[PDB]
Every structure is written in structure tokens, then in C-alpha cells.
Amino acid sequence: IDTEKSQQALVQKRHYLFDVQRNNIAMALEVTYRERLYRVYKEVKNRLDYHISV
Amino acid sequence: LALKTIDWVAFAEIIPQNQKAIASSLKSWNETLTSRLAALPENPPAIDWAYYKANVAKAGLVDDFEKKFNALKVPVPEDKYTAQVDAEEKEDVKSCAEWVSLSKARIVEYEKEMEKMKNLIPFDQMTIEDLNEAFPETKLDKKKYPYWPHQPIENL
């Protein structure tokens, strides 16, 4: 009995795989967005200061 | 940005041995993705044009760069990948719950049988036929040894 009930507790714990990946899918799409933000921000700023530099 | 908090040893127990390497990859990327999110804020600091309105002598070029900026639509990346793992999650809980049902059946069987050994008639009033009913192993195989004492003499 004690072995079987241990397996059930474990089965109930199975859900941790799917949230992990879901976390990684969540963060990655957040990263590539913020990178896209800094990239666009930084580039346009560069063309600006170049005009200031020349 | 709502994440789900996660244990790591609890993560470890529920991985089969055939995909342990993938699990490590999900662990590494999870760590890295936390660091990269820590090392940058959410929005870039949009620079005031005052420093660039009064410091460029080029003919109105600062205006159309900034007009092109406020009217710029950066492509927000869409998911295209979490719906299909949610469906895989649903499918899993189905396979989980049906097994918990099966195991539950083996539990309730052990409870009845445990109770049977628990309420055993004391050994003094027990006929040997009652014992062989209790411990079906103690019976003597009248097929392999038909004649008395129904067992090899060594085991006697």
C-alpha cells in the first residue's frame, strides 16, 4: 500500500514538466521582444549621435 | 509576465530515464533565460528629442527619424508553441488519472486482503486445511508427490 500511494503522490507531481517548458516558452518570447526593443532603440539612437558627431 | 514557480528536485523525480538529457537542457535554458531577463529592463529609455532637436543642424532629418519611430510597430512575437504543449498536458493527465484509478483498484484489493490476514482465526483452533486456506503455500502438492508423506523426506 505504502509503495502504491507513493506512486500516486508522484503521479500528482507529474505536472512540473509542462510548466517548465511553458516557462521557457514564456521567457524566450519575452527576451526576443526586449532584444528587439533595445536593438531598434539603440540603432536609431546611433544614427542620431552620428549626426551629432560629424 | 506571469511565470509559474518551480522546484528542481521535484522536477527530477518525474522524468523517465530515456529523456534525462532533455530535462537537463530544460534546466540549463531555464537558468539562462532567468539571467538574461535579469540583465535588462522592460522598456528602453526613449531619449527626449530636446538634445536632438537643438543639436542637429541637418535640415529636418531629426524630425522624420522620430516620426518614423513613434509610428514604428515592432513585431510582438506570438506564441505558436504553448497551445500544443497544453494539449499534450491534457493528454498526459488523462493517462495519469486512468493509472491512478488502476492503482487505486490495487490499493482497495490489498486492504480487503490485509483485513483477511488481520482477522485470522487463532492458530490453536486451526485445522491444517484451514492453514492451507490461509497460506496456500503450505499445502502439499499431491500431484508431484501422491503418496505419503506427500513431500521429499529432506524437507520433512
Swiss-Prot record, chain A:
<feature type="modified residue" description="N6-acetyllysine">
    <location>
        <position position="5"/>
    </location>
</feature>
<comment type="function">
    <text>Subunit b, of the mitochondrial membrane ATP synthase complex (F(1)F(0) ATP synthase or Complex V) that produces ATP from ADP in the presence of a proton gradient across the membrane which is generated by electron transport complexes of the respiratory chain. ATP synthase complex consist of a soluble F(1) head domain - the catalytic core - and a membrane F(1) domain - the membrane proton channel. These two domains are linked by a central stalk rotating inside the F(1) region and a stationary peripheral stalk.</text>
</comment>
<comment type="similarity">
    <text>Belongs to the eukaryotic ATPase B chain family.</text>
</comment>
<feature type="modified residue" description="N6-acetyllysine">
    <location>
        <position position="13"/>
    </location>
</feature>
<comment type="subunit">
    <text>Component of the ATP synthase complex composed at least of ATP5F1A/subunit alpha, ATP5F1B/subunit beta, ATP5MC1/subunit c (homooctomer), MT-ATP6/subunit a, MT-ATP8/subunit 8, ATP5ME/subunit e, ATP5MF/subunit f, ATP5MG/subunit g, ATP5MK/subunit k, ATP5MJ/subunit j, ATP5F1C/subunit gamma, ATP5F1D/subunit delta, ATP5F1E/subunit epsilon, ATP5PF/subunit F6, ATP5PB/subunit b, ATP5PD/subunit d, ATP5PO/subunit OSCP.</text>
</comment>
<protein>
    <recommendedName>
        <fullName>ATP synthase peripheral stalk subunit b, mitochondrial</fullName>
    </recommendedName>
</protein>
UniProtKB/Swiss-Prot annotation, chain B:
<keyword id="KW-0375">Hydrogen ion transport</keyword>
<keyword id="KW-0813">Transport</keyword>
<keyword id="KW-0406">Ion transport</keyword>
<feature type="modified residue" description="N6-succinyllysine; alternate">
    <location>
        <position position="80"/>
    </location>
</feature>
<dbReference type="Pfam" id="PF05873">
    <property type="entry name" value="Mt_ATP-synt_D"/>
</dbReference>
<dbReference type="GO" id="GO:0005739">
    <property type="term" value="C:mitochondrion"/>
</dbReference>
<feature type="modified residue" description="N6-acetyllysine; alternate">
    <location>
        <position position="90"/>
    </location>
</feature>
<dbReference type="GO" id="GO:0045259">
    <property type="term" value="C:proton-transporting ATP synthase complex"/>
</dbReference>
<comment type="function">
    <text>Subunit d, of the mitochondrial membrane ATP synthase complex (F(1)F(0) ATP synthase or Complex V) that produces ATP from ADP in the presence of a proton gradient across the membrane which is generated by electron transport complexes of the respiratory chain. ATP synthase complex consist of a soluble F(1) head domain - the catalytic core - and a membrane F(1) domain - the membrane proton channel. These two domains are linked by a central stalk rotating inside the F(1) region and a stationary peripheral stalk.</text>
</comment>
<feature type="modified residue" description="N6-succinyllysine; alternate">
    <location>
        <position position="144"/>
    </location>
</feature>
<keyword id="KW-0999">Mitochondrion inner membrane</keyword>
<feature type="modified residue" description="N6-succinyllysine; alternate">
    <location>
        <position position="139"/>
    </location>
</feature>
<feature type="modified residue" description="N6-succinyllysine; alternate">
    <location>
        <position position="73"/>
    </location>
</feature>
<feature type="modified residue" description="N6-acetyllysine">
    <location>
        <position position="58"/>
    </location>
</feature>
<feature type="modified residue" description="N6-acetyllysine; alternate">
    <location>
        <position position="144"/>
    </location>
</feature>
<dbReference type="GO" id="GO:0042776">
    <property type="term" value="P:proton motive force-driven mitochondrial ATP synthesis"/>
</dbReference>
<dbReference type="InterPro" id="IPR008689">
    <property type="entry name" value="ATP_synth_F0_dsu_mt"/>
</dbReference>
<feature type="modified residue" description="N6-acetyllysine">
    <location>
        <position position="112"/>
    </location>
</feature>
<dbReference type="InterPro" id="IPR036228">
    <property type="entry name" value="ATP_synth_F0_dsu_sf_mt"/>
</dbReference>
<comment type="subunit">
    <text>Component of the ATP synthase complex composed at least of ATP5F1A/subunit alpha, ATP5F1B/subunit beta, ATP5MC1/subunit c (homooctomer), MT-ATP6/subunit a, MT-ATP8/subunit 8, ATP5ME/subunit e, ATP5MF/subunit f, ATP5MG/subunit g, ATP5MK/subunit k, ATP5MJ/subunit j, ATP5F1C/subunit gamma, ATP5F1D/subunit delta, ATP5F1E/subunit epsilon, ATP5PF/subunit F6, ATP5PB/subunit b, ATP5PD/subunit d, ATP5PO/subunit OSCP.</text>
</comment>
<feature type="modified residue" description="N6-succinyllysine; alternate">
    <location>
        <position position="90"/>
    </location>
</feature>
<feature type="modified residue" description="N6-acetyllysine; alternate">
    <location>
        <position position="73"/>
    </location>
</feature>
